[PDB]
């Protein structure tokens, strides 16, 4: 028995390959011959309707302009998931690429605000992303950013989650903190020079990334709030959204552009 999200297979045209991997593939395509869409194919060898359908409900229930929207599914294998198309790809490729040159703090804080808005919706609904970071954010026209791909990357993960599996909205706040350094360095790996083992030992004994060049210290404080040892002292996304939305009036009103930020 199938639900309202199902579509017939004839309605999809896959046109350009965009991404690859062990999971499957991602294509840009057309739905019902008239609707630009992203399509994610899954190889028949990989995870079955036992763990597909449990993980489908998440993307079927949650709905917000700052989370990448499900449009349709072909559920019987081979599986196809159809979502909205984000014309600029992942945030990480965006910042690294041709556009990074031109982005400055106002745009970068704005993108942060938007993700914070998406995650504040996840927070209200009592969910947890678990792998929040630039690679899992998509960008569209007019710098619209949307959270994607809800769950090894210990550099983005809060210590309590990486050591004890305590994944909570507060461990997503930590990852947001790291995301802010990706935004403010145009997409560089965090903890540059440090292998994964080095990062746990250091973070656990108090080490935190310093202020990136040309980034205001007030913004690096926000980062340090997200990186508090004690999960419950980290701010909410409601707070973070508000802080970033209001940033240039309330916090940094004499901001003057520089060479990179
Ligand atoms: C960066 C590029 C390859 N890409 N990836 C995507 C993309 C990223 C993650 C996705 C995750 C998806 O969900 C995975 C999944 C897995 C099991 C069950 C369900 Cl319901 C859903 C579906 C489509 C996706 C599509 C994308 C997009 N929507 N628009 C434009 N470009 C996109």
User: What structural domains does the chain harbor?
Assistant: 1-85 (3.30.200.20), 86-254 (1.10.510.10)
List strand residue ranges (DSSP E) for 32-95, in order: 35-42, 70-74, 79-83
User: Residue 228's Cα: distance from chain center in Å?
Assistant: 21
Q: Write down the experimental method used for this entry.
A: X-ray
Q: Are 137 and 147 in contact (CB under 8 A)?
A: yes
Q: Can you tell me the distance from the alpha carbon of 256 to that of 100, in angstroms, rounded to the nearest whole number?
A: 18
Q: How many residues does the chain have?
A: 261
Residue 96 assigned as binding residue:
no
Question: What Å resolution does this PDB entry report?
Answer: 2.7
Show the tokens assigned to 126: 């009592």
Q: Which protein residues are within 6 Å of ligand 1, measured from CB?
A: 18-19, 26, 38, 40, 52, 55-56, 59, 68, 81, 83, 85-86, 89-90, 138, 148-149
Q: What is the DSSP string of 125-192?
A: TT---S--SGGGEEE-GGG-EEE------GGGS-HHHHHH----HHHHHHHHHHHHHHHHTTSPPSST
């Amino acid at each position: 028995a199938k639900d309202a999200w199902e579509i017939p297979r004839e309605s999809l045209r896959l046109e350009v390959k965009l991404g690859q991997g062990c999971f499957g593939e991602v294509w840009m395509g057309t739905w019902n011959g008239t609707t630009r869409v992203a399509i994610k194919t899954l190889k028949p060898g990989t995870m079955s309707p036992e763990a597909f359908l449990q993980e489908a409900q998440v993307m079927k229930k949650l709905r917000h302009e700052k989370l990448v929207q499900l449009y349709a599914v072909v559920s019987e294998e081979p599986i196809y998931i159809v979502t909205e198309y984000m014309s600029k790809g992942s945030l990480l490729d965006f910042l690294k690429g041709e556009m990074g040159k031109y982005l400055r703090l106002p745009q970068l804080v704005d993108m942060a605000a938007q993700i914070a808005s998406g995650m504040a919706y996840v927070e209200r609904m009592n969910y947890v992303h678990r792998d929040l970071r630039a690679a899992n954010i998509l960008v569209g026209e007019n710098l619209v950013c949307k959270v994607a791909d809800f769950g090894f990357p210990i550099k983005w993960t809060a210590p309590e989650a990486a050591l004890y599996g305590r994944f909570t909205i507060k461990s997503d706040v930590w990852s947001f903190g790291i995301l802010l350094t990706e935004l403010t360095t145009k997409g560089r790996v965090p903890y540059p020079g440090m292998v994964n083992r080095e990062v746990l030992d250091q973070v656990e004994r108090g080490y935190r990334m310093p202020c990136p060049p040309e980034c205001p210290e007030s913004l690096h404080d926000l980062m340090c709030q997200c990186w508090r040892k004690d999960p419950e002292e980290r701010p909410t996304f409601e707070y973070l959204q508000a802080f970033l939305e209001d940033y240039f009036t309330s916090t940094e009103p004499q901001y003057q552009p520089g060479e990179n930020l």
